[PDB]
Design a protein around this ligand. Structure first.
Ligand code: BOG
Ligand code: BOG
Ligand code: BOG
Ligand code: BOG
Ligand code: BOG
Length: 257
């Protein structure tokens, strides 16, 4: 199976066409943020009654569009990642959604076997990424990136680097690279069935950035208990230039590996 190998997983054909493939993690946690960005969402009619406690979730799927496109162990794929912040408890304002980040990708991935002194480069993926919050001005955030995702493992460790280059219109947030940087590092450690993870981005030039620490353990064969702690800038597109520390607990399907 090869833990956390996204590309190798996509090559494994499913009998039922409706059985999709996981790309990033899939979870639904009840959170509590340190500070809520009302300044950015001031245009909303419920902005003032915004609660610091929100239901946060992430949906992430991969769709193999063409296997073996560039030889065996290669694939032309697509993926969809959605992160949503929901003011569920806020019954006073009809439980509105504060932000949703739609993140579809089109890539060319390869399942590899390169040795790096104990480590093994399992995935090499290169593609285009679109990320917008589907909002109308002034609360509209959006940016496009061309990237490369590398994944390597070493026993109970997993490391994934994802450098990128911004392409296209950045008018909705001209300085988004100031807070996001030029790459994303992800680390995962397997302590038996417990999975510890780290995911962050950092601009070494400006000093801005954010990080995410997570810990899961299986409830059953498919679901897991997940605890997350984000801290820094760029949690969501609307909060790309807003700093906050968020803690949440909930359920998770798949983790890093
Ligand atoms: C399940 C609810 O769905 C949510 O509804 C929101 C409000 O329309 C949308 O902004 C989100 O994209 C959607 O995930
Ligand atoms: C995956 C299918 O989705 C599409 O992926 C594109 C990737 O380039 C995005 O630019 C589009 O906005 C998105 O609709
Ligand atoms: C490494 C393989 C990458 C496959 C992703 C296909 C991206 C096609 O997508 C196109 O990419 C262009 C890049 O300059 C953009 O200018 C276009 O707006 C976008 O539609
Ligand atoms: C395979 C390992 C790839 C690591 C990706 C790191 C790339 C991030 O590197 C960044 O590049 C920018 C443009 O040159 C510089 O301005 C930044 O100072 C630098 O941090
Ligand atoms: C961060 C995890 O660190 C690991 O923890 C293991 C369990 O204690 C040790 O056996 C390993 O040497 C250590 O790298």
């Amino acid at each position: 199976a090869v833990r956390g190998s996204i590309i190798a997983n996509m090559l494994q054909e499913h009998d039922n066409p409706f059985t999709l493939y996981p790309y990033d993690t899939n979870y639904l946690i009840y959170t509590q943020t340190s500070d809520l960005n009302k300044e950015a969402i001031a245009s909303y009619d419920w902005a003032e009654n915004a609660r610091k406690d929100e239901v946060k979730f992430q949906l992430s799927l991969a769709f193999p569009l063409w296997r073996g496109i560039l030889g065996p162990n290669s694939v032309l794929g697509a993926s969809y990642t959605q992160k949503s912040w929901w003011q569920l408890s806020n019954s006073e304002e009809s439980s509105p959604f504060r932000e949703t980040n739609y993140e579809p990708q089109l890539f060319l991935g390869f399942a590899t076997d390169y040795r790096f002194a104990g480590w093994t480069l399992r995935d090499v993926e290169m593609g285009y990424n679109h990320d917008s919050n589907g909002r109308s001005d002034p609360t509209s955030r959006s940016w496009n990136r061309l990237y490369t995702r590398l994944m390597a493992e070493n026993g109970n460790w997993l490391v994934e680097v994802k450098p990128w280059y911004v392409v296209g219109n950045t008018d909705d947030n001209p300085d988004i690279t100031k807070y996001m940087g030029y790459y994303q590092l992800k680390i995962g450690y397997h302590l038996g069935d417990a999975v510890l993870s780290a995911k962050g981005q950092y601009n070494w030039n400006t000093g801005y950035g954010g990080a995410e620490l997570g810990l899961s353990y299986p409830i059953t064969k498919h679901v897991r208990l997940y605890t997350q702690v984000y801290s820094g800038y760029g949690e969501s597109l609307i909060d790309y230039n807003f700093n906050q520390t968020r803690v949440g607990v909930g359920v998770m399907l798949n983790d890093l590996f």
